Write a protein that binds this DNA or RNA. Structure first.
Ligand code: MG
Ligand code: MG
Ligand code: ZN
Ligand code: ZN
Ligand code: ZN
Ligand code: ZN
Length: 85
DNA sequence: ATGAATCTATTGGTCAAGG
DNA sequence: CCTTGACCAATAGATTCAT
């Protein structure tokens, strides 16, 4: 069958349906080790990891919580979000 | 001064090929 | 099957643009 039990969307295989269904169940088994990010698809965690460090970018660490960032403006957004005081 | 438009960086949903 | 990753829309914040 490979059809979503929640919205009826049809798929060509079981695994794409499994990933899709997590958007109805809220399940997010893939959790980043370097921040609170969590996701339903393993390659999504891989892509998110680029924001903590990537070839061709430096690493800017948060002076307060030590979290690493490959993009400095993202570290600035992190400062505003988590360490606003 | 204010809001619309438009950038960046990043993420969510989708789809399909590699292992 | 699980893994992988390209692609396109959406999102949040920053900035520019128009008036
Ligand atoms: Mg499919
Ligand atoms: Mg591929
Ligand atoms: Zn569904
Ligand atoms: Zn199936
Ligand atoms: Zn993370
Ligand atoms: Zn921090």
């Amino acid at each position: 069958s490979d059809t979503c039990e929640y919205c009826g969307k049809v798929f060509k295989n079981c695994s794409n349906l499994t990933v899709h269904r997590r958007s109805h169940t809220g399940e997010r088994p893939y959790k980043c080790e370097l921040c609170n990010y969590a996701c339903a698809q393993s390659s999504k965690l891989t892509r998110h990891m680029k924001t903590h460090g990537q070839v061709g970018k430096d690493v800017y660490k948060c002076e307060i919580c030590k979290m690493p960032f490959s993009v400095y403006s993202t570290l600035e957004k992190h400062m505003k979000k988590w360490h606003s005081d």
